[PDB]
């Protein structure tokens, strides 16, 4: 890897610079390099890794949706034939997206997850695993579509089981996991009732635990609770 010769601390320093410059591809490459040093990541470092790839793949997903919509329109009756170009370019963006997902999943499998013993780290990585299988599922149309969806579900479910045993209901990782697993149910598993039940139950159990928190923890937890509420409002 092209980051093999750079110090771990220098990679982290540059990831932070890249974030400030909104250079997310660079940020992601720096963090991949840092992970490949083979040491466990701190909480701050895990956040850098997740922010980087979230922004890169988020952009690819947005572009893929623009292109898929144009392609869909092209296959409506009355649309004049414009050749293979729309499909080709949607495929190009799709393949790059799958590449990024495969890269993240590879980092998690080699060897972030297996070295993650504390609940906070393990849940965080398993959530990411769910997220990146979810992104693969969004674009999947073939023989493996069901297995991709199940891979997402399985990762989310393990994360959920740990989070419920080991973390308080207001823990931002537990919250963010529930938020995303709820979206998985609504958007990927065709289970809107499960999505709604999960978001509601998570919101309500968090509400009842807010009294235990400092002002700063309250701010963190309520921000994510509002996202649960936003989704519920969208869905009901």
């Amino acid at each position: 890897g092209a980051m093999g010769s750079m110090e771990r601390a220098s990679l982290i320093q540059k990831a932070k610079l890249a974030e400030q410059a909104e250079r997310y591809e660079d940020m992601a490459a720096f963090m991949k390099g840092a992970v490949e040093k083979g040491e466990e990541l701190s909480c701050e470092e895990r956040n850098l890794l997740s922010v980087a790839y979230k922004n890169v793949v988020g952009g690819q997903r947005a572009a893929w949706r623009v292109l898929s919509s144009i392609e869909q329109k092209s296959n409506e009756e009355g649309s004049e034939e414009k050749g293979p170009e729309v499909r080709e370019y949607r495929e190009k963006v799709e393949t790059e997206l799958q590449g990024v997902c495969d890269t993240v999943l590879g980092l998690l499998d080699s060897h972030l997850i297996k070295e993650a013993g504390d609940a906070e780290s393990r849940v965080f990585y398993l959530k990411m695993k769910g997220d990146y299988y979810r992104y693969l599922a969004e674009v999947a149309t073939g023989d493996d579509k069901k297995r991709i969806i199940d891979s997402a579900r399985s990762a989310y479910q393990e994360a959920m089981d740990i989070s419920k045993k080991e973390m308080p209901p207001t823990n931002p990782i537990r919250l963010g996991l529930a938020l995303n697993f709820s979206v998985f149910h609504y958007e990927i598993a065709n289970s809107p009732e499960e999505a709604i039940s999960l978001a509601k139950t998570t919101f309500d159990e968090a509400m009842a635990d807010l009294h235990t928190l400092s002002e700063d923890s309250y701010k963190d937890s309520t921000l994510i609770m509002q996202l649960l509420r936003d989704n519920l409002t969208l869905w009901t």
Partner: peptide, 5 residues
């Protein structure tokens, strides 16, 4: 589309 983090 819905919120995720």
């Amino acid at each position: 589309f819905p919120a995720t983090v």
